[PDB]
Curated annotation (Swiss-Prot):
It comes from Homo sapiens (Human). Heteromer. Composed of TAMALIN, CYTH2 and at least one GRM1. Interacts with ARRB1. Interacts with ARL4D; the interaction is direct. Directly interacts with CCDC120 through the coiled coil domain; this interaction stabilizes CCDC120, possibly by preventing its ubiquitination, and is required for neurite growth in neuroblastoma cells. Interacts with ARF1. Interacts with FRMD4A. Interacts (via N-terminal domain) with INAVA (via N-terminal domain). It is found in: Cell membrane; Cytoplasm; Cell projection; Cell projection, Growth cone. Binds via its PH domain to the inositol head group of phosphatidylinositol 3,4,5-trisphosphate. The PH domain is necessary and sufficient for plasma membrane relocalization. Autoinhibited by its C-terminal basic region. It comes from the Eukaryota. Widely expressed. This is Cytohesin-2. Residues 21-150 form the SEC7 domain. Acts as a guanine-nucleotide exchange factor (GEF). Promotes guanine-nucleotide exchange on ARF1, ARF3 and ARF6. Activates ARF factors through replacement of GDP with GTP. The cell membrane form, in association with ARL4 proteins, recruits ARF6 to the plasma membrane. Involved in neurite growth.
Length: 196
């Protein structure tokens, strides 16, 4: 009756909500929330982003990286959706970066990678003694990926160099070379793939 008719309109409005989001994230979410298609909670918005169905990955990245209190709360709920226990850093990063595309702005990326590092360290408490180590190492992996796989960059970091640039970041000590090698191999053999 009404329910069937209601479900139809809801589904189409949902689709519209998705198109609106892809144009302007905050507007999409507001349309969805106001039409009771989505609860306006950090957890439920994050789940929506995590599922990602019909969502432009650049848009998701844009939303998650905003300064606003809710966007920050969504970002933390979003990374909390990820279970990184016993994944190595590259595997964890790979999964995290599949669900969005990084925003251009430095401040936005910062908040996103900081949320990632906190979650990874929480999921793997023995591994790092600080989120700083995780953060910096995550960007070393991202740079190595880019360094390796961008034509413009003309001398590839070899394993020896990679190990070298990361000295001292493990609370004044180094990372186990074996860890650095695993990361290096992981990235060389399966490079990060831009999200589709």
């Amino acid at each position: 009756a009404n329910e069937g008719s209601k479900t139809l309109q809801r589904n189409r409005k949902m689709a519209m909500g998705r198109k609106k989001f892809n144009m302007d994230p905050k507007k999409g979410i507001q349309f969805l929330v106001e039409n009771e298609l989505l609860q306006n909670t950090p957890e439920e918005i994050a789940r929506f982003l995590y599922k990602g169905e019909g969502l432009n990955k650049t848009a998701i990245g844009d939303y998650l990286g905003e300064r606003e209190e809710l966007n920050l709360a969504v970002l933390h709920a979003f990374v909390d959706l990820h279970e990184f226990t016993d994944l190595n850093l590259v595997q964890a990063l790979r999964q995290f970066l599949w669900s969005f595309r990084l925003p251009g702005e430095a401040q936005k990326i910062d908040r996103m990678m900081e949320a990632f590092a906190q979650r990874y360290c929480l999921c793997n408490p023995g591994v790092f003694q600080s989120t700083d180590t995780c953060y910096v190492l995550s960007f070393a992996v991202i740079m190595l990926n880019t360094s390796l796989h961008n034509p413009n960059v003309r001398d590839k970091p070899g394993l020896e160099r990679f190990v070298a640039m990361n000295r001292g970041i493990n609370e004044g000590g180094d990372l186990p070379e074996e860890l650095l090698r695993n990361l290096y191999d992981s990235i060389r053999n399966e490079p990060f793939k831009i999200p589709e």
